Amino acid sequence: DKDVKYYTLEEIQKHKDSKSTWVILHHKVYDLTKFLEEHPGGEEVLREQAGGDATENFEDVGHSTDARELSKTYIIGELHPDDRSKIAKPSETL
Ligand code: HEM
Numbered sequence: 001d002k003d004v005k006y007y008t009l010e011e012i013q014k015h016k017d018s019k020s021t022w023v024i025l026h027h028k029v030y031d032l033t034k035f036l037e038e039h040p041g042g043e044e045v046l047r048e049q050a051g052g053d054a055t056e057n058f059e060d061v062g063h064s065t066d067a068r069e070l071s072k073t074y075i076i077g078e079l080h081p082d083d084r085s086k087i088a089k090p091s092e093t094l
Contacts, residue, residue, distance in 0.1 A: 005077040009051075009086065016051025022076075023049060025058045026068065026091045027084045031076045038074075055091040 007029055012022045021032045023046060032039075032046045039046060041061070049057045084090060 001078075006080045007077050008080040008083045010083075012051045014051075018043075018047060021047055021050040023052070023054050024079055024090050025054055025063075025071075027079055027089065028071070029076055029079050030071050031074050035074050053087055053090045059091060 009024070012024065012029065014020075015022050015033075018036075019033070021036065022029060023032050032050070036043050036046065045057075079090070
């Protein structure tokens with residue numbers, strides 16, 4: 001796809017603080033900071049795995065599919081292709 005913006009981990013690593021907490025899931029990054037007081041799970045959970053792969057931490061609670069679609073709302077961009085291939089692959093790979 002075009003237009004969309006591709007972010008890298010090296011960058012996200014920056015916004016790894018409460019002020020700006022990001023999380024990568026399903027080879028896709030989203031805005032957690034905005035979904036800090038929206039997540040029916042809490043904040044610590046997110047922070048716990050802020051600016052880092054939370055595939056397991058995500059699939060652990062087998063996030064409902066409705067979430068995979070809800071995320072769209074709180075979308076931010078995509079995760080660099082060279083980044084995803086940096087840690088095998090966050091959630092699935094095929
Ligand atoms: C790394 C990040 C995340 C972690 C670690 C996480 C963890 C969890 C956990 C453990 C639950 C259960 C309640 C709790 O103890 O918190 C839960 C539920 C839920 N989470 Fe997350 N979550 C994350 C990100 C997200 C995101 C981005 C969304 C939305 C896009 C989301 C949407 C939901 C919803 C809707 C529920 C209720 C599950 C149900 O469908 O029954 N979560 N989450």
